[PDB]
RNA sequence: GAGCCGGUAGCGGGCGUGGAUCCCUGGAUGUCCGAAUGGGGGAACCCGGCCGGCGGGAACGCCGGUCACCGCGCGCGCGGGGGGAACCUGGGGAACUGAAACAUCUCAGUACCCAGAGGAGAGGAAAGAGAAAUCGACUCCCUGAGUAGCGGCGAGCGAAAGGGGACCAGCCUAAACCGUCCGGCUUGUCCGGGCGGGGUCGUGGGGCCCUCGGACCGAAUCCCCAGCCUAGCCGAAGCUGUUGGGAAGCAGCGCCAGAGAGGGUGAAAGCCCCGUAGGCGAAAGGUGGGGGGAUAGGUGAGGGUACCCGAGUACCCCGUGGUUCGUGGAGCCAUGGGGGAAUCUGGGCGGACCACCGCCUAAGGCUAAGUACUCCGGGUGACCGAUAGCGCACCAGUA
RNA sequence: CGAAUGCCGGCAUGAGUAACGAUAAAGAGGGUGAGAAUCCCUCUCGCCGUAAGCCCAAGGGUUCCUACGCAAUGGUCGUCAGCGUAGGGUUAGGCGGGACCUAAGGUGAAGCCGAAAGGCGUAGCCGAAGGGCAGCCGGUUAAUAUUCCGGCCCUUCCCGCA
RNA sequence: CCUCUAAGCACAACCUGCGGGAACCCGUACCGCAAACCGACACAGGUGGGCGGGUGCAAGAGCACUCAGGCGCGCGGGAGA
C-alpha cells in the first residue's frame, strides 16, 4: 500500500464493475452493469532485508522487482561503502537504477 | 510630468480674453496646478476680511485674482506685439523662447 | 549609527516632570525600544552626570479623529533617571 | 540648506575619514537633540534647521557607507 | 527650464539659473512580522551561543557580523522552501440536474482539493496514421462532421484519416568495441563503479576486421549592433467691431492645412492653451525571436564478420482506464496482479484469429515558433452615466 | 409598469396614542447660569449593608484627572456626564508574567504510515490560576505606588579578601 | 534544594562569612455583580476568587434594624373614575 522503491509503481485507481445475466456469445441477451464503484489497486509490496557493507538494508519494494534489489547489491560491490550508514547505502544503490 | 506654461513670472503679457481683455502688465505669479496666473492690476476683486490684528477696522481689501493661462499672451519686447511662442535651438545648444511675429527673444 | 542622542528624544514638559528636578529626577521622552541600561549611558554620555537609578514606562498613543476619520497618535516611552546626589542636568532646570 | 553648501558638504565629507565621519556625525546628532528640545518648548523658530541636520546626517552616513562598501 | 517644501490653506521658517520641486534608470539606507530559518511564539512578541566594538564594564545593556531544515556535489560550496488575477500539465474527483420516476447512462473527469511549471504549460521527430500501391514530429484554428460509430440504440455522447491555413527544426544519449582511474577477493584475458572516445538509425544503422577515397554545412550556447521598453522634445496659421458677466456667437477682412482626431479656455475657436499629421530622442537598467562573428556539433563506399541495438520490459492470461467504442465480434494506447523471451532469420502494427501483403522500429532524454490566459500599461467603442457601470467615480473590501 | 406578501429609498396612517426599563422617595434653601424638579453646597426624609460597600482575576482599552463646551448620543431637562475639543496622568532587583520547572494536551531528532495535502510518534522542546522564588508599614499627587519618598528588612549574579 | 560520585580539575573549583559593585523586557490609569465585561440599548438577565463589622432572634454567610462605605435606580406635576 505505497510506492515501490525500485519500480516507482504506485496505487492506481480501478473500477469495481458488477455484471449480471448471460453474455451474447453464450447465446444470451447480454451482460448488464449493476453497479460501478471506484476501487484502488496496490502493488504487491514486500520487505527485502539485505546486508551490504556489513550493514542491513531493507527495501519496501514490490514483489515484481525483488530480483532487482540483489542486482543492485551485486552491482554495488565496486563502491567505497564501508563506514557509511543505512540511509547512505540505500541512496547509493538507488543511484544505480 | 510638468504643467506646460508658455508664460512665466514675470514677463509682460496681454490679457487676451476675459473682462479685462486687452489690458497689459507683468505676471505677478504663476499657478501651474490650477494652470492659472495673476497679473498686476488685472482680475482685481474686492474681498472681505475680519476685523483682525492684521486687518483692523475690518473693511475689504482689493485682491488680484488668478486667470486661466490660455487667457494670457506674452508681449515680444522687440515688435511689442503679442505673439505665439516658438522655441529656438541656439548653439549652446540651449532652447530659448522667441517671438513668432519676429525672431526676437522673450526670456 | 546609534548614539545616546538616538535614545533620548525630548523632555517631559509637565508640572509633574518639573517637580522632580528638586530631587534630581529628570524625565525624558525616550525610545520605546530603549532600555534602562541603554538610557543611563545615554544621559551620562550626553549630560555629564552619574545616573544612579532609572524608571521607565510606556505611554500609549491617544486615539483622535478629524470628525470623520479615526487614527492614533504614536506610542511613546519615557524614563526617569536619578542622578548622583548633587549633580544637575542644567538644560532642564531651564526651566 | 543651500545647494552650493550641499555640494561643499559633500566635497568636504568625501575628503574625510570614517572615524572623522562617525565622530562628525555623532556631533550633529547632538546638534539635533539640542534643537529638538528647543522646538519642544517653542524656542525654535528657525525650525528648518532640523530637517537640514537629519539630511546632513543622512548625506554623511551615505558617504561613510560609500567608503566602507570597499 | 522656473517655480518648490504631497492631497493642504494657515501658524512658523526655508530652497531654487551656483538649474531646485518634478519625471525616468542604477546605488545606499531599509526598525519589526511574514516561506521566516538561532531558539520559542497567542504573527509583528519573548529568550540564547559564537566573534568583534561601545559604557567606569566582570556581572547588566545596546551596536555590527554569524548560527533552522532538505537535496545534490568533493566542515565548505551551488540549489530548493513561499507568493502570483486567471491561463497550463499531473495525482485525485462528486452532486444537483437530464433521462419528464430511476440503478447502467448523462451532468463530466466539468466544479472542487493537492503537487508542479512558466511566461507561457502540455505535446513533439513515428515500434504513427490506414488503403491512397500514399502520407511523413508535435501544437492551434478552419473543414472533414453532428459523417463514421457509441448508446437501459432511451436521454443523449461523438471521433480520426484526408484537404485548406499559421509556424517550421531538428537533436543528445543507452548497448557492442578501445583506453583510463579507483576497490572487491574467489587473483584476472575477472567482475563492478566512475570519466573519455566511439555511436544513435529503418533505402535498416552502428562496432570490430580488411580495402578504396580525406572541404563544405553550422547552431536552440557565447559576443557585438541596429530595433524596441522604461523619462522626453520641435511642432503651420487672426485681428477688429459688435450684443453679453464672459465670445469661441453674428458681421468684415485674412490665413494654415502631410495638422478640420479630440479636450480645454467665462458660451459654440482649424489658426488662445494642452494637443493632432509629420519628424527627433537615451548617459544608465531591461530586452534583443532581426543583422554580423565565433564555438560545441555535422559527413564517403562496396566486402566479409554475426558483438550491440534501451527488461521483470515485449508476450499470454486476470482486474481496469483512455479512444466514438456502455463486453460488444473488442483490436489499438496505458497498467495494479501472475507467468515470462529475443537482437534484424529480431520484434510491435494494419479492429478478435490464421495466412498473404504492407507500415513502422517501443521499454532513456531534450527541443524554438505558430497556441492559452490578462494583476499590469496603451488604443478604441451604434458600452454604462451615480438604483447604471466593477462590490468601491468619494479614504471600500471600508463603516 | 400599477401590482410579483416584488427590490432601493423617501414620506404618510395608527398618534400627540402606548410607552419613557423595577413602587428603595422625596422636600426646602443657597449659588451658578441667557435658560434649572434634573448641576454644585447645606440641612431634613427614605434605601442597600453575605450589599446595591472594599480588594484581586478574566474581559473592555483611555472610559481615570483637570480646564473650556451642550449640535449630536443621555428614553424628559441639563449649566451635568462614562459625550465634543485640548493638556496632563500608569515609575518595581522584592507585587504579576518572562530570561526557572513540569500536567493534560500541542509540537516533535530517531523511526513508522499515507495517491498529494497530510496522519502518527519514547526522548527533547512548548505549554499554568500547580510547583518554586527575595516587601512589610506610612506619607505624598487633581490623577500612579507593596512601583516615588521615609524608616526598617531581604534575594540573585560578577570581582576581590579570608 | 540537599546529597553521591565520572570524566576533568585539584595555582582551578565549590561551601560559609564579610566587602564594593551589578541587577534587564512586558504589565501597572480607570470600570470590574457592572452606565465601561457577555447580552444590538446607560437592558430588572449571566459572570471566578477574598473581606464582609454591631445588637437581638438557640445557631448561622438566615431574618429584621444599623457603622464605615454607597445609594433614592436619567421624565416630572397633579387627579382620586
Ligand atoms: Mg472486480
Ligand atoms: Mg451470436
Ligand atoms: Mg449491456
Ligand atoms: Mg523479503
Ligand atoms: Mg515475477
Ligand atoms: Mg532500467
Ligand atoms: Mg482691446
Ligand atoms: Mg500652435
Ligand atoms: Mg542606518
Ligand atoms: Mg503637582
Ligand atoms: Mg558612569
Ligand atoms: Mg515597566
Ligand atoms: Mg513596561
Ligand atoms: Mg474618547
Ligand atoms: Mg538633493
Ligand atoms: Mg502639510
Ligand atoms: Mg504664516
Ligand atoms: Mg531602533
Ligand atoms: Mg526566528
Ligand atoms: Mg518555531
Ligand atoms: Mg563578546
Ligand atoms: Mg549602551
Ligand atoms: Mg546583538
Ligand atoms: Mg511558485
Ligand atoms: Mg487529470
Ligand atoms: Mg467522493
Ligand atoms: Mg444522481
Ligand atoms: Mg442543471
Ligand atoms: Mg431534457
Ligand atoms: Mg443538462
Ligand atoms: Mg433526473
Ligand atoms: Mg424529470
Ligand atoms: Mg427521486
Ligand atoms: Mg462523463
Ligand atoms: Mg484534474
Ligand atoms: Mg505548498
Ligand atoms: Mg506555485
Ligand atoms: Mg508566445
Ligand atoms: Mg517545454
Ligand atoms: Mg528517435
Ligand atoms: Mg462532411
Ligand atoms: Mg455538414
Ligand atoms: Mg433503437
Ligand atoms: Mg463523455
Ligand atoms: Mg490531422
Ligand atoms: Mg494539413
Ligand atoms: Mg499570426
Ligand atoms: Mg517540416
Ligand atoms: Mg571502464
Ligand atoms: Mg549491418
Ligand atoms: Mg542544441
Ligand atoms: Mg507646444
Ligand atoms: Mg461690453
Ligand atoms: Mg473677436
Ligand atoms: Mg474638432
Ligand atoms: Mg485625423
Ligand atoms: Mg473641443
Ligand atoms: Mg456642438
Ligand atoms: Mg477648439
Ligand atoms: Mg506619429
Ligand atoms: Mg530613434
Ligand atoms: Mg553515419
Ligand atoms: Mg562499411
Ligand atoms: Mg548478433
Ligand atoms: Mg469506460
Ligand atoms: Mg459480451
Ligand atoms: Mg474496455
Ligand atoms: Mg482507430
Ligand atoms: Mg502489469
Ligand atoms: Mg523481419
Ligand atoms: Mg519474428
Ligand atoms: Mg504493442
Ligand atoms: Mg498484441
Ligand atoms: Mg495483430
Ligand atoms: Mg497499423
Ligand atoms: Mg486485418
Ligand atoms: Mg510479415
Ligand atoms: Mg504503422
Ligand atoms: Mg528502442
Ligand atoms: Mg518533455
Ligand atoms: Mg517554450
Ligand atoms: Mg508556443
Ligand atoms: Mg486596460
Ligand atoms: Mg456620457
Ligand atoms: Mg448614455
Ligand atoms: Mg449616487
Ligand atoms: Mg453604486
Ligand atoms: Mg443624478
Ligand atoms: Mg399590469
Ligand atoms: Mg404584511
Ligand atoms: Mg409589508
Ligand atoms: Mg394585506
Ligand atoms: Mg422594498
Ligand atoms: Mg390629550
Ligand atoms: Mg386610543
Ligand atoms: Mg389611550
Ligand atoms: Mg401614558
Ligand atoms: Mg421600603
Ligand atoms: Mg432648589
Ligand atoms: Mg436659586
Ligand atoms: Mg434642570
Ligand atoms: Mg436649563
Ligand atoms: Mg429623580
Ligand atoms: Mg451585617
Ligand atoms: Mg487586563
Ligand atoms: Mg467596547
Ligand atoms: Mg476623560
Ligand atoms: Mg446636547
Ligand atoms: Mg444644546
Ligand atoms: Mg442637550
Ligand atoms: Mg439625543
Ligand atoms: Mg437629551
Ligand atoms: Mg434609552
Ligand atoms: Mg454655559
Ligand atoms: Mg465643568
Ligand atoms: Mg468621571
Ligand atoms: Mg471627556
Ligand atoms: Mg462644535
Ligand atoms: Mg493639566
Ligand atoms: Mg522597589
Ligand atoms: Mg520573576
Ligand atoms: Mg539575563
Ligand atoms: Mg519544559
Ligand atoms: Mg503530530
Ligand atoms: Mg508525546
Ligand atoms: Mg530549558
Ligand atoms: Mg506559575
Ligand atoms: Mg504560582
Ligand atoms: Mg522567595
Ligand atoms: Mg515573587
Ligand atoms: Mg517581611
Ligand atoms: Mg498621579
Ligand atoms: Mg583560598
Ligand atoms: Mg561532593
Ligand atoms: Mg582522572
Ligand atoms: Mg592547581
Ligand atoms: Mg553583598
Ligand atoms: Mg533582557
Ligand atoms: Mg462607573
Ligand atoms: Mg465599583
Ligand atoms: Mg471599585
Ligand atoms: Mg447581583
Ligand atoms: Mg462578586
Ligand atoms: Mg453570582
Ligand atoms: Mg448576540
Ligand atoms: Mg453594553
Ligand atoms: Mg444591568
Ligand atoms: Mg452559573
Ligand atoms: Mg450572636
Ligand atoms: Mg433563629
Ligand atoms: Mg433565606
Ligand atoms: Mg438580609
Ligand atoms: Mg426584606
Ligand atoms: Mg424607575
Ligand atoms: Mg425613582
Ligand atoms: Mg426611572
Ligand atoms: Mg406622577
Ligand atoms: Mg385623573
Ligand atoms: Zn516680435
PDB file of N, CA and C in Angstrom, chain A residues 39-74:
ATOM      1  N   UNK A  39     -12.421   1.406  -7.000  1.00  0.00           N
ATOM      2  CA  UNK A  39     -11.575   0.761  -6.018  1.00  0.00           C
ATOM      3  C   UNK A  39     -10.183   1.388  -6.114  1.00  0.00           C
ATOM      4  N   UNK A  40      -9.173   0.661  -5.646  1.00  0.00           N
ATOM      5  CA  UNK A  40      -7.794   1.072  -5.854  1.00  0.00           C
ATOM      6  C   UNK A  40      -6.911  -0.161  -5.748  1.00  0.00           C
ATOM      7  N   UNK A  41      -5.975  -0.285  -6.684  1.00  0.00           N
ATOM      8  CA  UNK A  41      -5.139  -1.469  -6.829  1.00  0.00           C
ATOM      9  C   UNK A  41      -3.746  -1.171  -6.293  1.00  0.00           C
ATOM     10  N   UNK A  42      -3.286  -1.997  -5.327  1.00  0.00           N
ATOM     11  CA  UNK A  42      -1.989  -1.805  -4.705  1.00  0.00           C
ATOM     12  C   UNK A  42      -0.939  -2.694  -5.361  1.00  0.00           C
ATOM     13  N   UNK A  43       0.311  -2.237  -5.422  1.00  0.00           N
ATOM     14  CA  UNK A  43       1.398  -3.138  -5.815  1.00  0.00           C
ATOM     15  C   UNK A  43       1.725  -4.101  -4.684  1.00  0.00           C
ATOM     16  N   UNK A  44       1.977  -5.358  -5.045  1.00  0.00           N
ATOM     17  CA  UNK A  44       2.322  -6.361  -4.044  1.00  0.00           C
ATOM     18  C   UNK A  44       3.679  -6.037  -3.429  1.00  0.00           C
ATOM     19  N   UNK A  45       3.724  -5.010  -2.581  1.00  0.00           N
ATOM     20  CA  UNK A  45       4.966  -4.642  -1.918  1.00  0.00           C
ATOM     21  C   UNK A  45       5.341  -5.676  -0.864  1.00  0.00           C
ATOM     22  N   UNK A  46       6.645  -5.824  -0.647  1.00  0.00           N
ATOM     23  CA  UNK A  46       7.157  -6.675   0.415  1.00  0.00           C
ATOM     24  C   UNK A  46       8.497  -6.129   0.879  1.00  0.00           C
ATOM     25  N   UNK A  47       8.942  -6.620   2.030  1.00  0.00           N
ATOM     26  CA  UNK A  47      10.222  -6.213   2.583  1.00  0.00           C
ATOM     27  C   UNK A  47      11.346  -7.041   1.972  1.00  0.00           C
ATOM     28  N   UNK A  48      12.534  -6.445   1.915  1.00  0.00           N
ATOM     29  CA  UNK A  48      13.699  -7.124   1.362  1.00  0.00           C
ATOM     30  C   UNK A  48      14.927  -6.772   2.191  1.00  0.00           C
ATOM     31  N   UNK A  49      15.062  -7.395   3.360  1.00  0.00           N
ATOM     32  CA  UNK A  49      16.233  -7.151   4.191  1.00  0.00           C
ATOM     33  C   UNK A  49      17.462  -7.785   3.553  1.00  0.00           C
ATOM     34  N   UNK A  50      18.449  -6.957   3.231  1.00  0.00           N
ATOM     35  CA  UNK A  50      19.738  -7.412   2.738  1.00  0.00           C
ATOM     36  C   UNK A  50      20.815  -6.767   3.594  1.00  0.00           C
ATOM     37  N   UNK A  51      21.955  -7.441   3.705  1.00  0.00           N
ATOM     38  CA  UNK A  51      23.115  -6.890   4.390  1.00  0.00           C
ATOM     39  C   UNK A  51      24.150  -6.489   3.349  1.00  0.00           C
ATOM     40  N   UNK A  52      24.538  -5.217   3.370  1.00  0.00           N
ATOM     41  CA  UNK A  52      25.524  -4.667   2.450  1.00  0.00           C
ATOM     42  C   UNK A  52      26.508  -3.828   3.250  1.00  0.00           C
ATOM     43  N   UNK A  53      27.794  -3.971   2.935  1.00  0.00           N
ATOM     44  CA  UNK A  53      28.857  -3.265   3.647  1.00  0.00           C
ATOM     45  C   UNK A  53      28.718  -3.463   5.154  1.00  0.00           C
ATOM     46  N   UNK A  54      28.514  -4.718   5.547  1.00  0.00           N
ATOM     47  CA  UNK A  54      28.302  -5.051   6.942  1.00  0.00           C
ATOM     48  C   UNK A  54      27.160  -4.271   7.557  1.00  0.00           C
ATOM     49  N   UNK A  55      26.169  -3.919   6.739  1.00  0.00           N
ATOM     50  CA  UNK A  55      25.040  -3.119   7.187  1.00  0.00           C
ATOM     51  C   UNK A  55      23.758  -3.632   6.552  1.00  0.00           C
ATOM     52  N   UNK A  56      22.707  -3.712   7.364  1.00  0.00           N
ATOM     53  CA  UNK A  56      21.418  -4.218   6.918  1.00  0.00           C
ATOM     54  C   UNK A  56      20.692  -3.157   6.102  1.00  0.00           C
ATOM     55  N   UNK A  57      20.263  -3.525   4.897  1.00  0.00           N
ATOM     56  CA  UNK A  57      19.495  -2.642   4.030  1.00  0.00           C
ATOM     57  C   UNK A  57      18.203  -3.353   3.657  1.00  0.00           C
ATOM     58  N   UNK A  58      17.076  -2.687   3.889  1.00  0.00           N
ATOM     59  CA  UNK A  58      15.756  -3.262   3.671  1.00  0.00           C
ATOM     60  C   UNK A  58      14.956  -2.347   2.759  1.00  0.00           C
ATOM     61  N   UNK A  59      14.337  -2.921   1.730  1.00  0.00           N
ATOM     62  CA  UNK A  59      13.531  -2.157   0.790  1.00  0.00           C
ATOM     63  C   UNK A  59      12.056  -2.498   0.956  1.00  0.00           C
ATOM     64  N   UNK A  60      11.205  -1.483   0.816  1.00  0.00           N
ATOM     65  CA  UNK A  60       9.768  -1.695   0.653  1.00  0.00           C
ATOM     66  C   UNK A  60       9.431  -1.687  -0.840  1.00  0.00           C
ATOM     67  N   UNK A  61       9.814  -2.773  -1.500  1.00  0.00           N
ATOM     68  CA  UNK A  61       9.710  -2.901  -2.949  1.00  0.00           C
ATOM     69  C   UNK A  61       8.613  -3.900  -3.292  1.00  0.00           C
ATOM     70  N   UNK A  62       8.031  -3.726  -4.476  1.00  0.00           N
ATOM     71  CA  UNK A  62       7.007  -4.644  -4.947  1.00  0.00           C
ATOM     72  C   UNK A  62       7.625  -5.990  -5.307  1.00  0.00           C
ATOM     73  N   UNK A  63       6.814  -7.046  -5.196  1.00  0.00           N
ATOM     74  CA  UNK A  63       7.311  -8.397  -5.422  1.00  0.00           C
ATOM     75  C   UNK A  63       7.830  -8.602  -6.840  1.00  0.00           C
ATOM     76  N   UNK A  64       7.498  -7.707  -7.770  1.00  0.00           N
ATOM     77  CA  UNK A  64       7.928  -7.888  -9.153  1.00  0.00           C
ATOM     78  C   UNK A  64       9.432  -7.692  -9.295  1.00  0.00           C
ATOM     79  N   UNK A  65       9.952  -6.580  -8.783  1.00  0.00           N
ATOM     80  CA  UNK A  65      11.348  -6.205  -8.964  1.00  0.00           C
ATOM     81  C   UNK A  65      12.259  -6.703  -7.848  1.00  0.00           C
ATOM     82  N   UNK A  66      11.768  -7.573  -6.972  1.00  0.00           N
ATOM     83  CA  UNK A  66      12.577  -8.132  -5.888  1.00  0.00           C
ATOM     84  C   UNK A  66      13.931  -8.586  -6.426  1.00  0.00           C
ATOM     85  N   UNK A  67      13.977  -9.367  -7.511  1.00  0.00           N
ATOM     86  CA  UNK A  67      15.279  -9.793  -8.051  1.00  0.00           C
ATOM     87  C   UNK A  67      16.148  -8.644  -8.534  1.00  0.00           C
ATOM     88  N   UNK A  68      15.620  -7.418  -8.601  1.00  0.00           N
ATOM     89  CA  UNK A  68      16.449  -6.270  -8.946  1.00  0.00           C
ATOM     90  C   UNK A  68      17.255  -5.784  -7.744  1.00  0.00           C
ATOM     91  N   UNK A  69      16.678  -5.854  -6.542  1.00  0.00           N
ATOM     92  CA  UNK A  69      17.403  -5.481  -5.329  1.00  0.00           C
ATOM     93  C   UNK A  69      18.774  -6.149  -5.309  1.00  0.00           C
ATOM     94  N   UNK A  70      18.784  -7.483  -5.267  1.00  0.00           N
ATOM     95  CA  UNK A  70      20.039  -8.221  -5.250  1.00  0.00           C
ATOM     96  C   UNK A  70      20.946  -7.781  -6.393  1.00  0.00           C
ATOM     97  N   UNK A  71      20.360  -7.529  -7.566  1.00  0.00           N
ATOM     98  CA  UNK A  71      21.119  -6.954  -8.672  1.00  0.00           C
ATOM     99  C   UNK A  71      21.823  -5.673  -8.244  1.00  0.00           C
ATOM    100  N   UNK A  72      21.070  -4.726  -7.680  1.00  0.00           N
ATOM    101  CA  UNK A  72      21.679  -3.507  -7.156  1.00  0.00           C
ATOM    102  C   UNK A  72      22.829  -3.847  -6.218  1.00  0.00           C
ATOM    103  N   UNK A  73      22.546  -4.669  -5.207  1.00  0.00           N
ATOM    104  CA  UNK A  73      23.563  -5.178  -4.294  1.00  0.00           C
ATOM    105  C   UNK A  73      24.739  -5.703  -5.104  1.00  0.00           C
ATOM    106  N   UNK A  74      24.521  -6.812  -5.812  1.00  0.00           N
ATOM    107  CA  UNK A  74      25.527  -7.408  -6.683  1.00  0.00           C
ATOM    108  C   UNK A  74      26.269  -6.348  -7.489  1.00  0.00           C
TER     109      UNK A  74
END
